[PDB]
Design a protein around this ligand. Structure first.
Ligand SMILES: [Cl-]
Ligand SMILES: [Cl-]
Ligand SMILES: [Cl-]
Ligand SMILES: [Cl-]
Ligand SMILES: [Cl-]
Ligand SMILES: [Cl-]
Ligand SMILES: [Cl-]
Ligand SMILES: [Cl-]
Ligand SMILES: [Cl-]
Ligand SMILES: [Cl-]
Ligand SMILES: [Cl-]
Ligand SMILES: [Cl-]
Ligand SMILES: [Cl-]
Ligand SMILES: [Cl-]
Ligand SMILES: [Cl-]
Ligand SMILES: [Cl-]
Ligand SMILES: [Cl-]
Ligand SMILES: [Cl-]
Ligand SMILES: [Cl-]
Ligand SMILES: [Cl-]
Ligand SMILES: [Cl-]
Ligand SMILES: [Cl-]
Ligand SMILES: [Cl-]
Ligand SMILES: [Cl-]
Ligand SMILES: [Hg+2]
Ligand SMILES: [Hg+2]
Ligand SMILES: [Hg+2]
Lengths: 297, 297, 297, 297
């Protein structure tokens, strides 16, 4: 029922000069142009979707483009639609979710396997790799982060969890969910509180409120849209640096206007370049690009 | 049960200098700045949501803005979330849908009532009024257009139907669905074939395929998205003229690059400025703004 | 002394798939890829430099790119460096200027010959050809516009004059300078008043003040910068539609924010799609991209 | 005759939150916000123009802005237009240039005086201060570097020389020109060989060829442009890290793609963090932002 298997998992490799939306498997991976080299020079970013979704959705493809259009980025979108239960939503959602939930560790091993090859067969340093995951894909990402460590490879430079799935993980121990230790830097974007979780999970946790996303609708009816805003938020931050600025999580957070690079953080690829750590409040707009300020820090 | 009432219908009125997202009713309407004048000079456009939705969602507010930012547009977003069952999705979808569908002529009569006022008390000419409506909203708009003709006001200059609901309407008589005679020009955008309908409904029917929108995911799992794409596609056509060019529906459609204003049409507020009528094929891209060609015709 | 001669005039043809910064002549031209076909289907735009300048300069290469990048554009930059005295700035500037000024009708004839060839041998319709010229290159382009008429080819769709040289032209009759009659649409960008001229010369005259451009320096020391600011402005307007919005020229010009498409005009390739004609005022910002509004109209 | 005096020297002080393009003097400096504190925590950078120029030109303000946009930077732009002969350009260039060159040490002393204050009264350590100078401004900057060492302050962390003026300095003793001992790190950008000089002057010398800048025009006609390019190239390196990558100078320079932080250096604020020292060849593009690789190292 909505099964897992390595031959069933596929990838889409995108570089500035390779937008062929073709799918590769661990076999056909070497047939990719960028993989015809002996050394891969680009920054590598894996993107993994969650429950009942797929790599070729608008939101994830946009993210792949905003990265690939930066120049030295090789993007690998991980597609596990089958094990994610996407190929069959016929009823019992709660049973399905629980199946895809448990498949998260396997897709994570898959990612780690591909990672081992980039490192040992293409000379890609771990400092050059990042994982990006949404909902269940976020836990997938961390399990991958745990696995590479086990494989004696070291830690990923950064793992970005886009609104990490809450049910079945909220109160798990660090070993059974995305966790602040899975990479050198773990960046968490929180947007929904039913499909997602307010629970703190990374080096830095950005609390884009963090529930009832503005413009998404009513509190629960709009839950799925608030869940998806995490993917769209991160994309705008890749596109426009400092689009979203976060302030030290407070009951009376200061305004973004008062920010300095010593206590606030610009959500995005360079979040780790800012020294402050922990939870941050991050106000947002109701329509794209949602940015909460024009200045940079 | 998901009931209708004039006093329950609200409006959000937007103009370049009146972004107040406040709600008015046939009573509080006269209190709006734009309605304190004795003659409204703007082009007036009604925007109406469909099943289990509401006027202040991102997509529609973004449409209301793309219009108001042009300058002489007064935008009236029709909100009927209760008659549309928004406020109570508690199980039985098929029964609810039927009440919302039934409520369409009522909201339509409501729109016609606001039109008779624009016409008679504010001197707005029917040539200056357009209706836009999504899913059930489209049929609502059609009823409004039929209603005004019965009221002796003549026809609206145009009614735009974005992916008109199919279940309960696809095989209706012209009098019980949005129809090509409900306005001087009726522009229909087709994007999904289960929630929407492939059947011809207007002066011009743009078939952005028209099912399984690109980037929306798998066939049925991405139906809700495909259905919503029509609101986004149009909005983008409002923002960028000719974003989406349609070629005469062919089993072997010619490329958009070969188009001339004589056989092709730019989906939008000015589609009627193009002579070709009938069905058109409209290729689309997988990510906003989806446009299919840089050229203008 | 700073002589004119057909073989000394050279061209650079840039298409999306041909950025070979190679020079061709009326001879070696047929050897260019795009000219190996029987018919050229791209939109054609000539770009002509001014006194003591040349085709392969930054600003003109930037404009060539901003065009080509927009899909169906075939860019031909006219290089007449010797006839423009570039190749010999040895003293008496005022004498050299007069030399180049006389050569302007000759380079114009040349462009007209090339136009005759695009039309007759490649079936390039005049409606598909535009000329952009700066300083002395504007007059050159106007003379080109005259020649083609004289040649019985009809008119260019549009001639765009970026800060037309003032000295030796400002008070010439229409037959001896760029003139509103040289093409169907003539777009004049005014930026400096000593090197350029305030006099009206087109269907539309945009007065980006029009002298002492912001950020150019002191009134007369920055003359040369204000003069070049015409080319840089046009490029940003090809890049960003409505980057620069002109309001009706007035003693007390309304602000750009109050604009609508019926009285304002977005400087650029699409200016003529805007109904208002005449002189416009265009406030500008002091640093690239200089745009004066985020809204489009 | 194009005279010098402390009173006449003015500064523009810019911080992320203080874009007031106001001028201050040794007297009015204390009236600046950032200077009301008892300490200045920002990283501080001086930017000094050269012959017949000024602090408020487009290129320099763009640079000021590109730094301040980096969060912790107080940018002080040194304006000495009168002593640089900007306010009188009337005839004899070689004599005027002779006077401005003479005034360079005076302006350097001024800069050194402002530095002693930053150090002694605002507790800004030398480690946090950088000087950036163009043409004569480069030598002025180097004179300030000498002066601070004379003042018992220690060295400036870095001095960046943008196309240092060649005539009247090219063959001077280290004491009468910008020199590799003027700061802990001295970064020189070479772009023109007549206004500038190919002679080595720093810890590292980047040879953006280093003459006849591409896109600047003919060999001597575009000398002034080639000379200003160094200001723009540096501005882009602050904006895009590794925009311009330097390769060991060779009669057969390897390409930038084969680069590694071990043998190549990214021109910019962080060049000194790259191990390789000496002369580098730097290939460049013909139009903004000129960058020569998309990779970072
Ligand atoms: Cl980036
Ligand atoms: Cl964006
Ligand atoms: Cl976007
Ligand atoms: Cl954008
Ligand atoms: Cl952009
Ligand atoms: Cl962009
Ligand atoms: Cl951006
Ligand atoms: Cl930015
Ligand atoms: Cl950017
Ligand atoms: Cl934008
Ligand atoms: Cl657009
Ligand atoms: Cl975008
Ligand atoms: Cl857009
Ligand atoms: Cl967009
Ligand atoms: Cl735009
Ligand atoms: Cl754009
Ligand atoms: Cl844009
Ligand atoms: Cl920029
Ligand atoms: Cl731009
Ligand atoms: Cl950056
Ligand atoms: Cl960046
Ligand atoms: Cl970057
Ligand atoms: Cl840039
Ligand atoms: Cl940019
Ligand atoms: Hg970055
Ligand atoms: Hg733009
Ligand atoms: Hg950048």
């Amino acid at each position: 029922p909505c099964p897992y298997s390595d031959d069933t998992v596929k990838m889409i490799i995108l570089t500035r000069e390779n937008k062929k939306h073709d799918f590769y498997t661990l076999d056909t991976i070497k047939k990719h142009n960028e993989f015809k080299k002996s050394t891969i020079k680009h920054q590598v970013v894996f993107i993994t979707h969650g429950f009942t979704s797929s790599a070729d959705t608008e939101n994830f493809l946009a993210m792949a483009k905003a990265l690939s259009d930066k120049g030295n980025y090789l993007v690998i979108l991980i597609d596990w639609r089958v094990a994610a239960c996407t190929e069959e939503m016929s009823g019992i959602q709660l049973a399905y979710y629980s199946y895809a939930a448990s498949n998260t560790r396997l897709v994570g091993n898959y990612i780690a396997t591909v990672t081992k090859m980039l490192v040992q067969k293409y000379n890609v340093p771990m400092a050059n790799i990042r994982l990006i995951g949404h909902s269940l894909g976020a836990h997938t990402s961390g399990f991958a982060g745990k696995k590479v460590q086990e494989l004696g490879l070291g830690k990923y430079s950064e793992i970005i969890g886009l609104d990490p799935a809450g049910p079945s993980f909220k109160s798990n121990d660090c070993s059974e969910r995305i966790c602040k230790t899975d990479a050198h830097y773990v960046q968490i974007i929180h947007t929904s509180n039913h499909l997602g979780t307010l629970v703190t999970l990374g080096t830095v946790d950005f609390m884009n409120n963090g529930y009832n996303q503005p413009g998404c609708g009513l509190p629960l009816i709009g839950e799925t849209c608030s869940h998806t805003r995490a993917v769209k938020y991160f994309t705008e931050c890749i596109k426009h640096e400092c689009c979203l600025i976060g302030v030290p999580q407070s009951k009376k957070p200061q305004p973004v206007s008062k920010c300095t690079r010593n206590e606030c953080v610009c959500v995005g690829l360079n979040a780790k370049t800012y020294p402050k750590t922990g939870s941050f409040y991050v106000p947002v707009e109701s329509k794209a690009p949602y940015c909460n300020n024009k200045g940079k820090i």
